[PDB]
Amino acid sequence: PEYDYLFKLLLIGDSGVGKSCLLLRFADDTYTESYISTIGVDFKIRTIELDGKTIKLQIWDTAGQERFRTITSSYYRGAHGIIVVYDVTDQESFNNVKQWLQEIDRYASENVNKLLVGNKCDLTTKKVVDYTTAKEFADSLGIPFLETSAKNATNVEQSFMTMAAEIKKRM
């Protein structure tokens, strides 16, 4: 009885896009570059407050290189919420969002919660996926959307809060 709800979260998306950095910013409000790549699955915990309710979040950060997909897909089925990340400077990462949603369709629970996040939104001079493009896509799917920056902290907290509210409502 030290928390009111316990949600499992999963972070999927291409290698490179900032999944670990988002998680690190959410869990510790820090950003550095002293970390080697994620090998397999990483895990962190953060408790939040939402409508006077204490929510324990168990978040899993996957590796997104193609060869990891199989083992990684075994982590979908338990999740309450799945965040799909792409890099706003990397068109290929956004194109692949379509595949990541199929993996969700294939391996997630039928009524799992989704969120689309376009990370690195501080790289303005390099940005190649427009907000309106990504936002129209998330719309057609009825999925919430934000652009974020693990680096500046832009919208990182919103992202997880939003996901948590989404799950809270479902339950």
Partner: protein, 351 residues
């Protein structure tokens, strides 16, 4: 007045895990053991190991595919004796060299010392030990084969940016500290995590000037520092360095163990244990014939099998491969040219 190389050969022979060693003595062995370096093996060799000590003695162990083991000692005076060694259940000689073997089981070792697992330092320190011990080869199929699928090696340059400055790296037995690693990151043209190497480095390697600067900040002897510069000036050095960090090398081994790794991840997150997800320790060598061999290790925390609860260890995955001449630092060329073997072991603490 006994040499470094002689000392190590005595230990390996009597047994690194021998119960009659005074623990303060196990200290000594570490310092010797970690000079050991995998290097390019000849055609009928399963593994070849080399150690060049600061007293100017060197040691060389060969292990034939038939597992016949010979050492060659060079005393500082440059005398050569060749010793024929035997591995058995008392010394566990073959368990205690950086070699991959065709065993029917993943090899288990016991970490020697109070090597705890609280933080970043202890973990690196663990991998620093395990990557001198043996590993058991694991086959892949098309699904787990790190070089098959639609995009083999897609992540290397990202993998290299994040790895350099956060790794233990050794070039011809010469330790390349974090500062020097950073210079290397620059010298390859990987200033930021999105770029590929410079067209120039891809074709001509690192400029002699960078190469020289990198070695000046690095540790080891002046003769050794010389081979490092000569090594980095090859186009192939770029290929060895970046390929060394490919994350998916680890898929065969995790395909076997990941649930137990995750279990350990959660055990640690539930206790505020600030442990990294993974650690890297690479050894790259170019023989006096110009042969380039890479040995890359990833260490990752792992729970003992169900029978021994709340106990924790490290899984070390070893990836070995020659970089043949003419193979340049491009994704497309790394794929159809490089041929890695994968091997793993599990090491458990003395807690």
């Amino acid at each position: 007045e006994m040499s470094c190389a002689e000392k190590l050969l005595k230990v390996l022979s009597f047994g690194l895990w021998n119960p009659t060693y005074s623990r303060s003595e196990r200290q000594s062995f570490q310092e010797l053991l970690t000079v050991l370096e995998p290097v390019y093996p000849l055609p009928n060799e399963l593994g070849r190991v080399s150690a060049r000590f600061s007293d100017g003695s060197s040691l060389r162990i060969s292990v034939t595919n038939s597992e016949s083991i010979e050492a060659e000692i060079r005393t500082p005076n440059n005398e050569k004796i060749t010793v024929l060694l035997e591995s058995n259940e008392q010394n566990r000689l073959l368990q205690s060299l950086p070699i991959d073997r065709h065993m029917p089981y993943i090899q288990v070792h016991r970490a020697l010392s109070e090597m705890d697992l609280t933080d970043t330092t202890s973990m690196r320190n663990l991998l620093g030990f395990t990557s001198k011990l043996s590993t058991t080869l694991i086959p892949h199929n098309a699904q787990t084969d790190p070089l098959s699928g639609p995009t083999p090696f897609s992540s290397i340059f990202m993998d290299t940016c994040r790895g350099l400055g956060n790794a233990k790296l050794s070039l011809n037995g010469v330790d390349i500290p974090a500062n020097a690693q950073m210079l290397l990151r620059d010298a390859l043209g990987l200033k930021d995590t999105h770029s590929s190497p410079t067209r120039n480095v891809i074709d001509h390697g690192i400029s002699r000037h960078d190469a020289e600067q990198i070695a000046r900040e690095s540790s080891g002897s002046d003769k050794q520092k010389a081979e490092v510069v000569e090594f980095l000036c090859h186009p192939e050095a770029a290929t060895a360095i970046c390929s060394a960090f490919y994350q998916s090398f680890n898929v065969p081994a995790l395909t076997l163990t990941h649930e137990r790794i995750s279990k350990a991840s959660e055990y640690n997150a539930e206790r505020s244990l600030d442990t990294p997800n993974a650690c890297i320790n690479i050894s790259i060598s170019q023989s006096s014939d110009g042969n380039i061999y890479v040995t890359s290790h990833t260490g990752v925390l792992i729970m003992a099998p169900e029978d021994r609860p709340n106990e924790m260890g490290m899984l070390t995955n070893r990836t070995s491969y020659e970089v043949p001449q003419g193979v340049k630092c491009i994704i497309d060329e790394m794929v159809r040219a490089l041929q890695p073997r994968y091997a793993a072991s599990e090491t458990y603490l003395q807690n």
